[PDB]
């Protein structure tokens, strides 16, 4: 869409905090990317582990609950790619850990399917429900790869590491 919105989205993806500070206004902090899956700057900064941009955006009114075209919130993006510090920052600023996208995948589904034990533990310690089923009838435990035995034990209810 607009020129300064595309550059803000790109600066968020790239971790270019200085350009974010120069282009970020109240009108643009939650702007959606028309030429993609309609992610906001916080989606990009969260998915690409741009901790300094994530901190800046949240402080300047970025919507921690913003949904992209598929129903993902920034906590989904961070949990999918193992960005523990970003995920902990989003939860600290009110991210709903049991939110589900259009296929009813929660962040715990993402973390369990990608093998992120510490992310799974983080979400469970903030109230994530391991019994939620997605559209395919699968719980987060049902998505755990064979070989991630510590996650299977964790989602079973064993003591965390």
């Amino acid at each position: 869409n607009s020129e300064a919105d595309r550059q803000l989205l790109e600066a968020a993806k790239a971790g270019d905090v200085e350009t974010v500070k120069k282009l970020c206004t109240v009108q643009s902090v939650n702007c959606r990317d028309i030429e993609g899956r309609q992610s906001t700057p916080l989606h990009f900064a969260a998915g690409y582990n741009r901790v300094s941009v994530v901190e800046y955006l949240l402080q300047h009114g970025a919507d921690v609950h913003a949904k992209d075209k598929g129903g993902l919130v920034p906590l989904h993006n961070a949990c999918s790619y193992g960005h523990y510090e970003v995920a902990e920052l989003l939860v600290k600023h009110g991210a709903v850990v049991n939110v589900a996208d259009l296929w009813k995948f929660t962040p715990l589904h993402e973390a369990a399917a990608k093998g992120k034990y510490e992310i799974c533990k983080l979400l469970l310690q903030h109230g994530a429900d391991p019994t939620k089923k997605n559209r395919d009838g699968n719980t987060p435990l049902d998505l755990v790869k064979d070989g991630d035995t510590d996650i299977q034990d964790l989602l079973r209810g064993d003591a965390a590491l």
């Binding site: 998915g47 999918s80 790619y81 193992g82 259009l102 995948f105």
Partner: peptide, 10 residues
């Protein structure tokens, strides 16, 4: 359609 992947990278 089919479910995509989130924006991001490791």
């Amino acid at each position: 359609t089919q479910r995509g992947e989130p924006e991001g990278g490791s």
